[PDB]
Amino acid sequence: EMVETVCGPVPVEQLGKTLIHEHFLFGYPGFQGDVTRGTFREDESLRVAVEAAEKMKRHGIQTVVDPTPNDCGRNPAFLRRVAEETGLNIICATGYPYEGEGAPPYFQFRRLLGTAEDDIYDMFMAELTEGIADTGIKAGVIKLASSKGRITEYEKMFFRAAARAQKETGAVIITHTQEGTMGPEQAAYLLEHGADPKKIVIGHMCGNTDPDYHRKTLAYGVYIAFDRFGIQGMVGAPTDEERVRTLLALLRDGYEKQIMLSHNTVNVWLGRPFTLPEPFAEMMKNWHVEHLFVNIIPALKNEGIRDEVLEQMFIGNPAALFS
């Protein structure tokens, strides 16, 4: 009935229109060592974050889930300044990135000692039920991630921990899948360990353009997220055209109570600034929090999709997810 946000418990009935996967801040593990040339600029990162919040608000969004992993710049007090300022509900995560874009040494060492999976459980339970650091903020979701073509033995520790914490807390799990692989594998493995499919979102499912792969994942009763709209031409991601063609096929099959959409924006990169070459930079040009509402959703409406299907995905599914 309630979900923990960066501003404390909010009734699930009041979450409203929700973007299921956006980052206000994100840094790739390793950004911490580049502090000298990549200092966190708090005032300017707040104004950009707050502006992103305002743009989402102009398209009706009342709630963002920000699943930034723990060592990737997750900053609950920062998110609370965004939420206090804009009135947006923001739900944060507890979780670690996949091995390929992570820093596994800390928990690999604890796996050597035989305490890793229990330690991850402990962290999940502390941040879900007591709070993150001294912020007073509980994560509302557990974030999981797997590698391309594999859920590594390291990653499996987090999956089992997440299942155990879900059984005890009822917390929503949100996953990352790499390059359109392991959707069905994630669902089956979470279910193996007693996780509840009604509380699981298998993410980055737009990374795969075969509706059969999607159906194999949906068959577990989990949600799937087409959560990378705008990301085109980079690290294996397909085009928004193929995302839409895949989604339309799922919607015409009646799967809208299982689908949620997002962009996976990074509104403020942590570490040193960068610029993409315009081959990439012009194809990444629609990767912003308004893209679903200015480019994608209208196109869907012009291909048959009704308002009540959109409301199911943006409003009904989050409400069901968190309750």
Added chain:
Amino acid sequence: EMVETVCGPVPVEQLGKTLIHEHFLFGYPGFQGDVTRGTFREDESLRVAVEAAEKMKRHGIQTVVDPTPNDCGRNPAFLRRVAEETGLNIICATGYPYEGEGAPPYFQFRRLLGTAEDDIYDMFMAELTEGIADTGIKAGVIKLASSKGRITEYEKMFFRAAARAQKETGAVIITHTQEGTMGPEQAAYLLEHGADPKKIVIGHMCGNTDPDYHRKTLAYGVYIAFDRFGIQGMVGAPTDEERVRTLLALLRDGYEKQIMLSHNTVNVWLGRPFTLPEPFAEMMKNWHVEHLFVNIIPALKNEGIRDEVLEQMFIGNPAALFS
């Protein structure tokens, strides 16, 4: 004539007896995501770090090189509090850990963009000549590391950047070798790119018990460090008895002006505390900052090593290295 310490420039001639490789603070990358259960207890860490400084001072140590990589908990202002309190000279580093036990994603991302090597050079130059973060502390050494049996292409970026920053600054390079591999490879590749052998310390050389490999490395004119005394069992490392037999062989061969000794201690672990399982726990019991003076040097003196040779290793070589 001077080297930058955590308390500013210190004349090289006053460095005195020096431990070339110890960590006051250290965490494995990823420790940052365990902030809730693994928070940094700064007042107790200072107490522990200062006591370690006092134990080292009790055996005549005036200077410690602390080569904690940038994303491994390097904390110049903390080290300065240690140095201010104890009068110990503390020299810190700029650098990143090797691929195996690091967080490669951040600079892998910039390598894809084509700026990584230059960015690493910029970082080295900024931390060597302007200051780390806002601490006002310059690193006095570049810290490099390679993987087991390979200097990876990612690692090679840092080697090349370090040679470039050495050419411009004359700064000392201190390396990590993994499991007794790549000693000769590191020296040759650094020299290939114009680095100065008299400013390079090839570390963790005690990981290899074959004096032919040490001689292969010393042939480049670099320093080598037997810098993990007390580490037994873990990370495949040899025993201290094996360390002493290899050392004694090179000393009886006349290589004292190329050799430095240290323990690579971690006086305060970052992240969540841990207890070593009793097997490793007993083998690791000598891994503390007094071990060389209390156990190793006595055995060496029993074996005929004279005080002048020890003074060469502890005083003469650090002075030559930094001068």
